[PDB]
Amino acid sequence: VLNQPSSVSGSLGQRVSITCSGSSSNVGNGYVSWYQLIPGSAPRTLIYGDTSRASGVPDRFSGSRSGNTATLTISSLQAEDEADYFCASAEDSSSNAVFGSGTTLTVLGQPKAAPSVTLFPPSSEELQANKATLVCLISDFYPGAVTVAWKADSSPVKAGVETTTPSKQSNNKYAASSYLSLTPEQWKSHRSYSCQVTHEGSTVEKTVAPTE
Amino acid sequence: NLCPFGEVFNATRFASVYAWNRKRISNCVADYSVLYNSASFSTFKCYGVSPTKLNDLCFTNVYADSFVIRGDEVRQIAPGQTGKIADYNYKLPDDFTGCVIAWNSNNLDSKVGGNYNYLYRLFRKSNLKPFERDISTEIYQAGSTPCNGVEGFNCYFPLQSYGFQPTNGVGYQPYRVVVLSFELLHAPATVCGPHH
Amino acid sequence: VQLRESGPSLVKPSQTLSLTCTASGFSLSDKAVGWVRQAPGKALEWLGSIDTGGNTGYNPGLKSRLSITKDNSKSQVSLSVSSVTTEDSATYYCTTVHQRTSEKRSCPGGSSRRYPSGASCDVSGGACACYVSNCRGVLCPTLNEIVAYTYEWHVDAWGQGLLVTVSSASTKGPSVFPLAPSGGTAALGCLVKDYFPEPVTVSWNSGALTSGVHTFPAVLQSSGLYSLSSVVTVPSSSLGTQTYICNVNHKPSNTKVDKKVEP
Numbered sequence: 023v024l025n026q027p028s029s030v031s032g033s034l035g036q037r038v039s040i041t042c043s044g045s046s047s048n049v050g051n052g053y054v055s056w057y058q059l060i061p062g063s064a065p066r067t068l069i070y071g072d073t074s075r076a077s078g079v080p081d082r083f084s085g086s087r088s089g090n091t092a093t094l095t096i097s098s099l100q101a102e103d104e105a106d107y108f109c110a111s112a113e114d115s116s117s118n119a120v121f122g123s124g125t126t127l128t129v130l131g132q133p134k135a136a137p138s139v140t141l142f143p144p145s146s147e148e149l150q151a152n153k154a155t156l157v158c159l160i161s162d163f164y165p166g167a168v169t170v171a172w173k174a175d176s177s178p179v180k181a182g183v184e185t186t187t188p189s190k191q192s193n194n195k196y197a198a199s200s201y202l203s204l205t206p207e208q209w210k211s212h213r214s215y216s217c218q219v220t221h222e223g224s225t226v227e228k229t230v231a232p233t234e
Numbered sequence: 235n236l237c238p239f240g241e242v243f244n245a246t247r248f249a250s251v252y253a254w255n256r257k258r259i260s261n262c263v264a265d266y267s268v269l270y271n272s273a274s275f276s277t278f279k280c281y282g283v284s285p286t287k288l289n290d291l292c293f294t295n296v297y298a299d300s301f302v303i304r305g306d307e308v309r310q311i312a313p314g315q316t317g318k319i320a321d322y323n324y325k326l327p328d329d330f331t332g333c334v335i336a337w338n339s340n341n342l343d344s345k346v347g348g349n350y351n352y353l354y355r356l357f358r359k360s361n362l363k364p365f366e367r368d369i370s371t372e373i374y375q376a377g378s379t380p381c382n383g384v385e386g387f388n389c390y391f392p393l394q395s396y397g398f399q400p401t402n403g404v405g406y407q408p409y410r411v412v413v414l415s416f417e418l419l420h421a422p423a424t425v426c427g428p429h430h
Numbered sequence: 431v432q433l434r435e436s437g438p439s440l441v442k443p444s445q446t447l448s449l450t451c452t453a454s455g456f457s458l459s460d461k462a463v464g465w466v467r468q469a470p471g472k473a474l475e476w477l478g479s480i481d482t483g484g485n486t487g488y489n490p491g492l493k494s495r496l497s498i499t500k501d502n503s504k505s506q507v508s509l510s511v512s513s514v515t516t517e518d519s520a521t522y523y524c525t526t527v528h529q530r531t532s533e534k535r536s537c538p539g540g541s542s543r544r545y546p547s548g549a550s551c552d553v554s555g556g557a558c559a560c561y562v563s564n565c566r567g568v569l570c571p572t573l574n575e576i577v578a579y580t581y582e583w584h585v586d587a588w589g590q591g592l593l594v595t596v597s598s599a600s601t602k603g604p605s606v607f608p609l610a611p612s613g614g615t616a617a618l619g620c621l622v623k624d625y626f627p628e629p630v631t632v633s634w635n636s637g638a639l640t641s642g643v644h645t646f647p648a649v650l651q652s653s654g655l656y657s658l659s660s661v662v663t664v665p666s667s668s669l670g671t672q673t674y675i676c677n678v679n680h681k682p683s684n685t686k687v688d689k690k691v692e693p
């Protein structure tokens with residue numbers, strides 16, 4: 023509900039801040055609180071009481087407020103600080119909390135790691151089930167901007183492809199996966215099945231082939 | 235030279251009645267013609283002397299006690315009177331020898347919305363002895379609970395502000411009062427009138 | 431210290447959804463319990479909380495379908511909702527809340543907080559009040575105080591979140607298949623194809639394997655069923671020597687199955 027910006031960006035080691043605009047009955051009271059959502063993890067409690075750091079919080083962060091707008095301030099940006107950030111406070115009752123629209127942080131300047139691709143053919147057991155699923159897995163790349171194509175015997179393939187959207191790893195790089203679902207009468211018929219990955223203009227691919 | 239009746243009566247400012255000011259008059263010529271003529275006075279009562287027969291009377295020492303009260307309480311500035319002012323602020327003895335002179339000061343001592351700067355003693359543990367001045371802010375014990383110097387419920391600040399707002403009726407408008415006490419001690423007379 | 435959520439992973443539309451939450455390291459007379467939710471792609475929505483006293487507060491626009499209950503002999507708080515729809519498919523979090531209402535005693539511009547002696551006060555009893563203008567005194571007229579309310583609220587700790595899918599479909603179990611294989615490394619894997627709904631647990635040798643196990647997010651096959659992969663980086667010479675088995679646990683279907691990644 024609270025009018026946060028959709029997104030924000032800074033640079034490693036630099037300063038950046040988010041704004042949270044509400045009304046007089048919710049933010050004007052003060053006692054605003056900020057939280058950090060690192061995906062795949064339960065959120066952190068960043069700030070509580072306009073500026074007070076929660077137990078175990080690093081001092082890289084600090085809160086601020088002027089009238090009906092709160093500000094979350096950080097400098098010395100880390101890679102582990104890439105996340106969503108949500109402001110919130112009570113409105114007209116201590117037991118009615120409201121959050122903001124959420125703002126996504128982009129920590130610019132990290133190493134543009136090239137992707138690492140692994141490709142698995144359909145397993146023999148899966149073929150015994152008269153199903154085929156080629157598995158293309160992608161690890162260790164940044165930014166989370168990637169495009170995947172499949173080629174049957176060097177020709178492009180459209181049907182049967184489902185692709186994830188990237189996700190964080192432990193080291194704040196990205197990882198994703200792609201699946202090409204085939205009938206075994208198709209897989210047995212071709213000689214090359216190639217997974218090609220486009221990352222920031224670079225191309226990395228792998229290729230499997232049927233055997234007996 | 236002349237006695238400073240001007241310095242008192244015509245003073246630009248006065249004291250709160252609980253802390254009434256006393257000026258000592260000695261070695262001068264008390265000429266009252268200014269007062270006989272200054273018909274702006276609302277009250278001019280003399281005790282122990284004829285009010286007209288002043289300029290031919292000598293006294294050893296005179297005391298000019300000046301303060302501010304409200305209209306209804308001017309009556310209390312007299313021997314053998316009772317009330318808040320006469321009992322807790324300014325008491326005159328029964329054998330009083332002197333004059334009580336008072337005049338309205340509404341133009342000077344009344345701020346619109348109330349002048350809350352002149353004080354009077356509301357609570358006191360005993361009545362004042364003649365010519366005594368109590369200036370204590372000792373917390374008064376109004377209730378049965380002892381106060382031990384801490385203000386609270388049934389534990390009150392013993393002084394209170396006059397609500398001197400201009401639009402009041404005359405009886406509640408501020409009055410400036412000067413009480414001249416004459417002492418005819420067994421010593422040389424140092425204050426005489428232009429007569430005698 | 432920690433919180434632990436529990437409840438259904440699937441619920442049919444229009445049914446009632448019931449979740450519960452337990453505490454560890456603390457119990458239900460020390461903090462207040464709140465319930466938050468997030469439908470991915472949407473922001474966080476407050477649902478309601480129940481405090482140490484035992485009364486409840488809710489989200490006004492959502493209270494029409496809500497209920498919170500409590501039982502502190504089990505260290506349990508229960509959340510529930512009726513007429514569940516698919517907008518509500520979301521992660522539901524059990525939260526440690528800190529909250530308290532607080533007053534402010536303000537006087538109008540032309541007045542101040544004091545005792546009859548004029549000294550500043552800052553209370554609301556023993557003969558102190560808002561007094562007028564230049565005054566010190568006991569009978570000096572008083573006047574109406576102005577009271578402002580501020581509301582504190584913040585979550586000091588979070589649970590791990592409980593994922594709820596709202597769908598008119600069965601809890602189909604997964605078909606789990608092994609994925610056999612310049613640096614000396616090799617790739618093992620387990621493909622966990624069509625199933626429904628999320629989540630899925632993937633351990634390797636019942637947790638013995640840790641460093642190397644890159645488990646991947648699932649996809650949504652156009653069929654409407656999920657499927658994922660879990661890959662392990664191992665040393666190439668340990669193959670055959672070390673039998674590698676993936677333990678896949680899909681609980682909504684009550685099926686845990688293990689597979690060798692055979693050479």
Ligand SMILES: *[C@@H]1O[C@H](CO)[C@@H](O)[C@H](O)[C@H]1NC(C)=O
Nearest residue numbers: 239240241243244268269272
């Ligand atoms: C006080 O001053 C006024 C004007 O200056 C004058 O009329 C009056 O005689 C004076 N009275 C005394 C007692 O000084």
